Amino acid sequence: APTIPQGQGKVTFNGTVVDAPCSISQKSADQSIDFGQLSKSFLEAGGVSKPMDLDIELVNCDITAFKGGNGAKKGTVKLAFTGPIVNGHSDELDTNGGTGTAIVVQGAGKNVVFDGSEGDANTLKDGENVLHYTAVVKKSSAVGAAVTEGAFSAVANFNLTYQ
Amino acid sequence: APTIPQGQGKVTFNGTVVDAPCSISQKSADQSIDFGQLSKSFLEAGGVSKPMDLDIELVNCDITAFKGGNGAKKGTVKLAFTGPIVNGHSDELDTNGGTGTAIVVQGAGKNVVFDGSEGDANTLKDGENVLHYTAVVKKSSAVGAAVTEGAFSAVANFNLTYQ
Amino acid sequence: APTIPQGQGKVTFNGTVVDAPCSISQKSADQSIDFGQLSKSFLEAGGVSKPMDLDIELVNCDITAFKGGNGAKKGTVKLAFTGPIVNGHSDELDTNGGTGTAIVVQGAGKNVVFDGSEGDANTLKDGENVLHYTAVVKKSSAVGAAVTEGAFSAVANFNLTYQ
Amino acid sequence: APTIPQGQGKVTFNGTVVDAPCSISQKSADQSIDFGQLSKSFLEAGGVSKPMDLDIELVNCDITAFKGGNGAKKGTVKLAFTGPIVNGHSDELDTNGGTGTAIVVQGAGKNVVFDGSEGDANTLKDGENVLHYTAVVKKSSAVGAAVTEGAFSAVANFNLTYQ
Amino acid sequence: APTIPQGQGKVTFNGTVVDAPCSISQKSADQSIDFGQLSKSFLEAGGVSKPMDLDIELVNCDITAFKGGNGAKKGTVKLAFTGPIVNGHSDELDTNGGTGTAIVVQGAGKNVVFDGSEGDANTLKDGENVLHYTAVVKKSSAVGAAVTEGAFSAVANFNLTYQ
Amino acid sequence: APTIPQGQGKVTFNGTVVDAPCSISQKSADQSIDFGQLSKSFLEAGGVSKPMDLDIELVNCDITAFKGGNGAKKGTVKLAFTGPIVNGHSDELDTNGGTGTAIVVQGAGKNVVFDGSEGDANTLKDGENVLHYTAVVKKSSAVGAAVTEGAFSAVANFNLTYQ
Amino acid sequence: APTIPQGQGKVTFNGTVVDAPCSISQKSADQSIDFGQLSKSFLEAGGVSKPMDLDIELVNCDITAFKGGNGAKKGTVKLAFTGPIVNGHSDELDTNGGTGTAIVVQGAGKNVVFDGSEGDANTLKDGENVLHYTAVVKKSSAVGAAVTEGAFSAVANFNLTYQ
């Protein structure tokens, strides 16, 4: 007897909301970079890998009322990256592994620092926006650094503030 | 002594079968949507997030013999979504949280209702099929609704019938 | 010790085969059309966007033996499009969104219908072939239709038969 | 008084080791396949579900010294699957349930048999490897087999040997 | 048994609509410029690359009723470019990289500024229109700027308004 | 007579609280790593398994007021791992079993030591944080160490302090 | 009270390094080929599909010092493909499925063999390089081979060595 539906399914929903004037798509909120396979000799020669796109897209920004009512806050943003750093460099990410290598993220004519400090303010427009960042791998600048024929793995976190 | 296999492993299998003329891949049977991070101000301004794909793929439908022998049942389907709804709206999903926000799923020129009722019949073809649905987040239409700077979480269920 | 290959990689392969006399390249099997950004006023004035190419290339058809042994089946094909349609029009695709707009695909001196029915038979030759189709956006012919300043999204499916 | 650590935690570790020349990741050692929801009519028509990936990845194989010192054993492997089988077929897995259905796993141009016997030897390379297998569901080939509108459940085990 | 269509395929559709009097083809909405390979010495000598076409085509403008009913708004448009800029220059795009180079986009007898401000109003006609822009690479005007033998990468965004 | 509820259920709740500025999810507070099945020969050759993720996520950190009022304590943390160690190495976990193998956990450009001592201070940001750690298995560095074809099992504990 | 960052995000990094003189982009390290839908009759007639690009790009090769110090090793490479093969052919990939079909990859005036053996040495230059390979589908050369109207699926692996 008991009736059986010809197709049962379920969908769930998740998200969050902040006081920001602009929204952040999950696709950019988190992400991962793969540098594939690198030549030791190349890195040992002080070489550097090709830049990877760490671009961050901002959506539904409508910073009109925002930049108006908030006065000085005229539609700029900045990021504060945090992670293990190479001593005396800061802008050099101390990857997790048994290698003498490191990762450097760059923004415009500046470098990214992973010491939790904020970077330069970035002007943005109404509606949609995107920040452009590049990441490369090189032999660490640490003293006595040496490239080990192993795997790479590193994690960096950042906060975004609006002005 | 006792011999030891050089690699032992195990694989299990699960599934089910119904009287439907078409099969449903697990990948669509259940799923989850993440709206990432939203701007309060934007939602408070009555704004709405970008559409998310809740598409449902149907496989091995071969509705030939089906639509023939079953007469009036000429190869259409419909969904009956069920969940908490906002009063006097029904098509507005009453998310679980301390926020004045809600989720609306849309199908074609119509909206989805989560009151357990069936939607419009949808013509399908032989072999493979897919239904197209979109989901967005907005400030709830509830009286006195207000957007709280917190997290979002909601669950909706649906049945699928064949005609 | 353990030796490490100087470059490891992997390639996978996928596809399928049917009783058709001609093969179908993946590039045409599935595809997507982007109409960019449209003027509301223009659409509201009953205007229509520019035609997009939905051409379908068929390869390795060699319909010699085919059209011979299969008699009446003298090297023609037809498509059966399926999707949400505007009532009383059928040839008008009921896009998914909160807009009063729709999509119309056209073939030769005829229009495409998304009710799952087959279109006109199309003569083809030996070796290589291609069908030519155009798609445009317009204000829906639905009663009380009105263009909303939002996004567009629609999905249509079709089967191909050989005669 | 008594001091309280500001965050206490614990991590455990498990695994095993064999005389194999190559290691086996847990992720492949065990696993599970879900075929979602199937059409009875389709199965009753003698239809068959889509192939599921039962691929087995082997890591750190370095079969150099191995294939050398072990002579005839020139870097091949094979699997011996074990489970309930359909009589007179063997390569057909007798699922556990009140349905007239069964599961068939396939490897290359051959089928997998669950009678505890070993399959064909598979050449592998140094470093990393992976075997490719597919699984499908069909109406059992058993005499008088009939598809019951219920659930599916089956378990199969296998050993891996190196040559 | 189960019937198999001789060719199954799927096509999707995307786009959006705004209150603009004219439509914008996707082909211009987004795009990319490649300056190929440049001579360091040349750039170091203060040289400048050849102009690249960043032209923006507007379609279905029919600004008749528009320019009429909207009075002062007599069929002109302007762009507001946004991106990283070189200090004290603004019209000089601070590319992302370890080079002392920059990009300058020019329009008519004026230069483009990437500070989010709007440029000069541009008269347009009924039906079809196109704006003409050029882009060149030069050694940055930044203090102490120097050309590094590396790669170039930059992203700029803009909004379009109608008057 | 006696009435019977149509569904009785019960839910319990557990947890704890410390003076830490940040909270610790149970999911990270405790956890377990499985290295699956390893090759003896590989380990005997001095090989090492692939890195496993022992990442520790910290939530609701809001270290604003914290890092302020606590002066020198400017938002850093460190871990003190404790367990059986291999003599003269310390950073090598003396697993429990009849094998000549051991486990090494690594953090950034440093290794983890299980002698109860604290590791390097790790800068963290406001809101959410995560530490990245890797674990591998190798043939123990103990004198006369030899890999036995058996099972692996080890337990390590750690405390977390905030500065 | 507790402060909430206006946008939190996280990025991870992965990769590896080998003793190779040249680096390998992930995009080529792994990949997948789709042959779309094929005609049975065509394959049965001994026909063959169109060639697919399996090109492998090598980056940052700088084989100057390499080819010098390593003497005989004057800047050549070769691949060793491994997978299921058709008996007495080797260069014919025994796809996984219930079809009488197979895949053949070709390089220059030679064919690729999936028996784990190395192919011909390929001269490469300094900086950037790319190898060109084609893949096609045909009716298997196996005895009694016959094309089944089903799906295709195959996996092949290879190592890269430098001389």
Curated annotation (Swiss-Prot), chains A, B, C, D, E, F, G:
Function (record text): Polymerizes to form the thick (6.8 nm in diameter) rod of the pilus (also called fimbria). The rod is a right-handed helical cylinder with 3.28 PapA subunits per turn. Pili are polar filaments radiating from the surface of the bacterium to a length of 0.5-1.5 micrometers and numbering 100-300 per cell, and enable bacteria to colonize the epithelium of specific host organs.
PANTHER family, per the entry: FIMBRIAL SUBUNIT ELFA, FIMBRIAL SUBUNIT ELFA-RELATED
Entry coiled-coil feature ranges: none
Designated gene of the protein: papA
GO terms under biological process: cell adhesion involved in single-species biofilm formation
Organism, scientific name: Escherichia coli
Keyword field: Disulfide bond, Fimbrium, Secreted, Signal
Protein name: Pap fimbrial major pilin protein
Organism lineage string: Bacteria, Pseudomonadati, Pseudomonadota, Gammaproteobacteria, Enterobacterales
Extra remark beyond the main annotation: Strains of E.coli that cause infection of the human urinary tract produce pap-pili which are hair-like appendages consisting of about 1000 helically arranged subunits of the protein PapA. These pili mediate binding to digalactoside-containing glycolipids present on the epithelial cells which line the urinary tract.
Keyword DNA-binding: no
Subcellular location: Secreted; Fimbrium
Disulfide topology: C22-C61
Broad class of where this protein is predominantly found: secreted
Similarity field: Belongs to the fimbrial protein family.
GO cellular component terms listed in the entry, alphabetical order: extracellular region; pilus
